């Protein structure tokens, strides 16, 4: 009934959040997270992002900034609030404030 | 005295010299001070290229990653160890195989965890640590059947003797994978200690202390970590290896222990562990008991080179170079994450 | 030291118990020093209320045991330089701790006898918990100051790289108005200085030979500045490695060093500033904490005495100190004496472990009410 | 939102450095963590907030207690891995506030 948490990110970041307590294998045996290994390309990454976005129990979604950039043309289509996407930093690449999907709505943030 | 000086070099002299040559290459304290001051991972590559590692990293892509550096260091260690193993003879060969069993005991846990979660073993094999890779094909095309994997392990893997502490594939489904891992490791460590004592001579006298410390640190740390878990005292007591100097009544007072202060009380009776516990402040910002035990382990391994005619130097080299790989990985992590404040936490070797 | 509290349950009159427990016992043998504990005759609540207070003061005693001796621990840790004669540094009042305890009596001025044992224990618990938080704050502040001084020691410890070079640096040898000439400091070990007199003249293409002066001289290392052009500093940085040195740069931190000097002095004087008040506060507060401890001890004794010997109230307890190796004969004779004063028909012989349920037995049992103080 | 983003910019860095410390001691446990998933320890409940007449969805951070990664540091990881768990709990609180 309640919402889950979903993650897309490096193996290290996913390990960290899993140790935090986010992971679960659903009745279909499909995890709520994905590690972005070099074998995983842009098309599959965005397929998983879209899956998280559609599925109603996902709730809060975490994505690193570089992966979000690689996913951007789906983050622009994402225009409903509840599936809350959070673009977060990583040891792989830093976070920056500019060009965040949600922050697009802010015009007074100089 | 077993006069190993008379007959060791007949079969193991070449590797005895070669492994010490390899040890001569492990980074010195000064080398670590050089690596500490690098600005970027490319700068680290350049400063590292002057050491034994040389151009091992030059063939990788321009955007260096600490994962890539770790993989390359592990690959180098594996290559060297496999060369020595291919040139070893029966007794030394068995000793080296005992060293590899430790990594096999984690690869097997990977395999069983994948099987009980019903995943293809071909996806698990790439994640295995190369030093303990399963060459045997009986452990392939398992069809995700725990019984198939268990029979494969018993019939075509050296861990057959260690799994006899367990009795059934049902144990794989029931027992937590950590309990399985640690029971296997206890069996392996006791078998290794018995093997070393049966080798006797300088090998025994120089290697047995290292495995005794391994048993004692296993006991201490298993106990300290088990407090906030469902793990019962009665099951915990089974995990302690009986080789360490704690064995009679020390392991017993630990099995009876229910707080860190009581674990420290058990440690107080041993000067070599009292010092580690007193030095391990364990409060935020300084050394933990894990760090102190790593330092003591490094000291014990370093001592293995003071004895000449014995196999213990190969185990000491493997563990020392593993520590050096983890040191370089840590320094790279600090350089990448700009956490310079704690870059000194590497354990110096020689 | 250790002290025992024994029920002394009346026997139809106080004297026929107290005099026999004290004078007759000591004249039988000098197994223990004896005195009266002076229980207050508190107002008795309902038996159900008293059974609740049984658990309340069962747990409270173990709680105050921790708190008071934590006060003592932090007292000693603050006063580590002179913690010797610890009993005086702790003593609530008097000349000796035994002198204090052998004269204890319920103190109206702190808390009144009129109120119920519930309320009195609650206020004592308030006092003890506030003492605990006050320790956690103030002793932690002193600990942070001490750790700051240890950080200062680290700043003054190790090689010159780990140490703050600060006043060791020779300020007279540096270039001023460094818009075109820049000086550097990357020189270390002693074994490398066999021709340093030529090295600090020729290390780079255009090194200036004399203001490149040795700043410090250890047995193991020499610290030396060098001068070069705006764009030639990297050559010196690399040639230092070629000569097997390590970086020791100072980057003109003179005003920074002055501020750091002021701060280290501030910490040094802050230790003196705060140590005295902390020791005074702990000295005063241990007295109150221990008085509360013995108050809880007395209330425990009274509730258990009433339960063991229902009303009317006839419990004039004994304070006993066992003598050297006296414990065995002492408790044997005490048990033999109390056989009938407290029924031998129950307990004593053995008891299982009553884990299931709300509460379980954590104390030995005897034909009497026995409690203890671990001074 | 911006202040919480700034705070993430450092809390997540601390989390990554704690993970680095964990790997230095415990070895590479990432595969064990990725495999032993079972059921989520942390879950979210959609809670309501009100401004004028508009409804604002907000998230309750909630615990199930199903920590499958218990014992994962039994022999080596221990305190370092526990601290990693703790720091990532901090980060999860921060990020649920952000969401």
UniProtKB/Swiss-Prot annotation, chain A:
Expressed in brain (at protein level). Pfam families: ATP-synt_F. It is found in: Cytoplasmic vesicle, Secretory vesicle, Synaptic vesicle membrane; Cytoplasmic vesicle, Clathrin-coated vesicle membrane. One of its GO terms (molecular function) is proton-transporting ATPase activity, rotational mechanism. It is a peripheral membrane protein. One of its GO terms (cellular component) is proton-transporting V-type ATPase complex. SUPFAM superfamilies: AtpF-like. Coiled coil: none annotated. Keywords: Cytoplasmic vesicle, Hydrogen ion transport, Ion transport, Membrane, Synapse, Transport. Its main location: membrane. GO terms for biological process: synaptic vesicle lumen acidification. InterPro entries: ATPase_V1-cplx_f_g_su (IPR008218), ATPase_V1-cplx_fsu_euk (IPR005772), ATPase_V1_fsu_sf (IPR036906). Gene3D superfamilies: ATPase, V1 complex, subunit F (3.40.50.10580). Belongs to the V-ATPase F subunit family. Subunit of the V1 complex of vacuolar(H+)-ATPase (V-ATPase), a multisubunit enzyme composed of a peripheral complex (V1) that hydrolyzes ATP and a membrane integral complex (V0) that translocates protons. V-ATPase is responsible for acidifying and maintaining the pH of intracellular compartments and in some cell types, is targeted to the plasma membrane, where it is responsible for acidifying the extracellular environment. PANTHER family: V-TYPE PROTON ATPASE SUBUNIT F, VACUOLAR ATP SYNTHASE SUBUNIT F. V-ATPase is a heteromultimeric enzyme made up of two complexes: the ATP-hydrolytic V1 complex and the proton translocation V0 complex. The V1 complex consists of three catalytic AB heterodimers that form a heterohexamer, three peripheral stalks each consisting of EG heterodimers, one central rotor including subunits D and F, and the regulatory subunits C and H. The proton translocation complex V0 consists of the proton transport subunit a, a ring of proteolipid subunits c9c'', rotary subunit d, subunits e and f, and the accessory subunits ATP6AP1/Ac45 and ATP6AP2/PRR. This is V-type proton ATPase subunit F.
Swiss-Prot record, chain C:
The modification N-acetylthreonine is found at residue 1. One of its GO terms (biological process) is synaptic vesicle lumen acidification. It is found in: Cytoplasmic vesicle, Secretory vesicle, Synaptic vesicle membrane; Cytoplasmic vesicle, Clathrin-coated vesicle membrane. One of its GO terms (cellular component) is plasma membrane. The keyword S-adenosyl-L-methionine does not apply. The keyword Acetylation applies. It is a peripheral membrane protein. One of its GO terms (molecular function) is proton-transporting ATPase activity, rotational mechanism. Keywords: Acetylation, Cytoplasmic vesicle, Hydrogen ion transport, Ion transport, Membrane, Synapse, Transport. Expressed in brain (at protein level). Belongs to the V-ATPase C subunit family. Subunit of the V1 complex of vacuolar(H+)-ATPase (V-ATPase), a multisubunit enzyme composed of a peripheral complex (V1) that hydrolyzes ATP and a membrane integral complex (V0) that translocates protons. V-ATPase is responsible for acidifying and maintaining the pH of intracellular compartments and in some cell types, is targeted to the plasma membrane, where it is responsible for acidifying the extracellular environment. Subunit C is necessary for the assembly of the catalytic sector of the enzyme and is likely to have a specific function in its catalytic activity. V-ATPase is a heteromultimeric enzyme made up of two complexes: the ATP-hydrolytic V1 complex and the proton translocation V0 complex. The V1 complex consists of three catalytic AB heterodimers that form a heterohexamer, three peripheral stalks each consisting of EG heterodimers, one central rotor including subunits D and F, and the regulatory subunits C and H. The proton translocation complex V0 consists of the proton transport subunit a, a ring of proteolipid subunits c9c'', rotary subunit d, subunits e and f, and the accessory subunits ATP6AP1/Ac45 and ATP6AP2/PRR. This is V-type proton ATPase subunit C 1. It comes from Rattus norvegicus (Rat).
């Amino acid at each position: 009934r309640g919402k889950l948490i979903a993650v897309i990110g490096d193996e290290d970041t996913v390990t960290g959040f899993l140790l935090g307590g986010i992971g679960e294998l659903n009745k279909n045996r499909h995890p709520n997270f994905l590690v972005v290994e070099k074998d995983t390309t842009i098309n599959e990454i965005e397929d998983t992002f879209r899956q998280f976005l559609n599925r109603d129990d996902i709730g809060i979604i975490l994505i690193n900034q570089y992966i979000a950039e690689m996913v951007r043309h789906a983050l622009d289509a994402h225009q409903r609030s509840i599936p809350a996407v959070l673009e977060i930093p990583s040891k792989e690449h830093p976070y920056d404030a500019a060009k965040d999907s949600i922050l697009r709505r802010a015009k007074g943030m100089f | 005295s077993f006069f190993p000086e008379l007959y060791f070099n007949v079969d193991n002299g070449y590797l005895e010299g070669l492994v010490r040559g390899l040890k001569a290459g492990v980074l010195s304290q000064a080398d670590y001070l050089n690596l500490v001051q690098c600005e970027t991972l490319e700068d680290l590559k350049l400063h590292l290229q002057s050491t034994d590692y040389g151009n091992f990293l030059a063939n990788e892509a321009s955007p260096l990653t600490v994962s890539v550096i770790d993989d390359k260091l592990k690959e180098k260690m594996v290559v060297e160890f496999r060369h020595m193993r291919n040139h070893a003879y029966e007794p030394l060969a068995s000793f080296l195989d005992f060293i590899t069993y430790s990594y096999m005991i984690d690869n097997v846990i990977l395999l069983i965890t994948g099987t009980l979660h019903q995943r293809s073993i071909a996806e698990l094999v790439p994640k295995c640590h190369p030093l303990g890779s399963f060459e045997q094909m009986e452990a392939v095309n398992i069809a995700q059947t725990p019984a198939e994997l268990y029979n494969a392990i018993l019939v075509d893997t050296p861990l057959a003797a260690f799994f006899q502490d367990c009795i059934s594939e049902q144990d794989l489904d029931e027992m937590n994978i950590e309990i399985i891992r640690n029971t296997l490791y206890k069996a392996y460590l006791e078998s290794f200690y018995k093997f070393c004592t049966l080798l006797g001579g300088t090998t025994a006298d120089a290697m047995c202390p290292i495995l005794e410390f391994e048993a004692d640190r296993r006991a201490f740390i298993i106990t300290i970590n088990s407090f906030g878990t469902e793990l019962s005292k009665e099951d915990r007591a089974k995990l302690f290896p009986h080789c360490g100097r704690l064995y009679p009544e020390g392991l017993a007072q630990l099995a009876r222990a229910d707080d860190y202060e009581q674990v420290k009380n058990v440690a107080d009776y041993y000067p070599e562990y009292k010092l580690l516990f007193e030095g391990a402040g364990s409060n935020p910002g300084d050394k933990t008991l894990e760090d102190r035990f790593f330092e003591h382990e490094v000291k014990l391994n370093k001592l293995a080179f003071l004895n000449q005619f014995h196999f213990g130097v190969f185990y000491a080299f493997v563990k020392l170079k593993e520590q050096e790989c983890r040191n370089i990985v840590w320094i790279a992590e600090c350089i990448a994450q700009r956490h310079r404040a704690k870059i000194d936490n590497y354990i110096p070797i020689f | 030291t250790e002290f025992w509290l024994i029920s002394a349950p009346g026997e139809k009159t106080c004297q026929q118990t107290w005099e026999k427990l004290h004078a007759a016992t000591t004249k039988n043998n000098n197994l223990a020093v004896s005195s009266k504990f002076n229980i207050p005759d508190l107002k008795v609540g309902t038996l159900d209320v008293l059974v609740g207070l049984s658990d309340e003061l069962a747990k409270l005693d173990a709680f105050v045991e921790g708190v008071v001796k934590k006060v003592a621990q932090y007292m000693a840790d603050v006063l580590e330089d002179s913690k010797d004669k610890v009993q005086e540094n702790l003593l609530a009042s008097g000349v000796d701790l035994v002198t204090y305890i052998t004269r204890f009596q319920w103190d109206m001025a702190k808390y009144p006898i009129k109120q119920s044992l519930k309320n009195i224990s609650e206020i004592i618990a308030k006092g003890v918990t506030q003492i605990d938080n006050d320790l956690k704050s103030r002793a932690s502040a002193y600990n942070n100051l001490k750790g700051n001084l240890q950080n200062l020691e680290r700043k003054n410890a190790g090689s010159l790289l780990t140490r703050s070079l600060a006043e060791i640096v020779k300020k007279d040898d540096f270039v001023l108005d460094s818009e075109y000439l820049v000086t550097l400091l990357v020189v270390v070990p002693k074994l490398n200085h066999n021709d340093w007199i030529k090295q600090y003249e020729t290390l780079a293409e255009m090194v200036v030979p004399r203001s490149s002066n040795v700043l410090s001289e250890d047995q193991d290392s020499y610290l030396c500045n060098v001068t070069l052009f705006k764009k030639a500093v990297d050559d010196f940085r690399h040639k230092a490695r070629e000569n097997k040195f390590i970086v020791r740069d100072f980057q003109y931190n003179e005003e920074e060093m002055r501020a750091d000097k002021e701060e280290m002095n501030r910490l040094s004087t802050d230790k003196k500033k705060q140590f005295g008040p902390l020791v005074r506060w702990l000295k005063v507060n241990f007295s109150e904490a221990f008085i509360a401890w013995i108050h809880i001890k007395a209330l425990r004794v009274f509730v258990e005495s009433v339960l063991r010997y229902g009303l009317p109230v006839n419990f004039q307890a004994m304070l006993l100190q066992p003598n050297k190796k006296s414990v065995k004969k002492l408790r044997e004779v005490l048990h033999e004496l109390y056989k009938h004063l407290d029924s031998s028909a129950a307990a004593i012989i053995d008891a299982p472990m009553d884990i299931p349920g709300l509460n379980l037995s954590q104390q030995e049992y005897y034909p009497y009410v026995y409690y203890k103080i671990d001074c | 939102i911006i202040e919480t983003k700034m705070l993430m910019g450092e809390v997540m860095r601390e989390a990554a450095f704690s993970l680095a410390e964990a790997k230095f001691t415990a070895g590479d446990f990432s595969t064990t963590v990725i495999q032993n998933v079972n059921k989520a320890q942390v879950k979210i409940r959609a809670k309501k907030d009100n401004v004028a007449g508009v409804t604002l969805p907000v998230f309750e951070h909630y615990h199930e207690g199903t920590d499958s990664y218990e014992l994962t540091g039994l022999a080596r990881g221990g305190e370092q891995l526990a601290k990693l768990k703790r720091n990532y709990a901090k980060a999860v609180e921060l990020l649920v506030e952000l969401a």
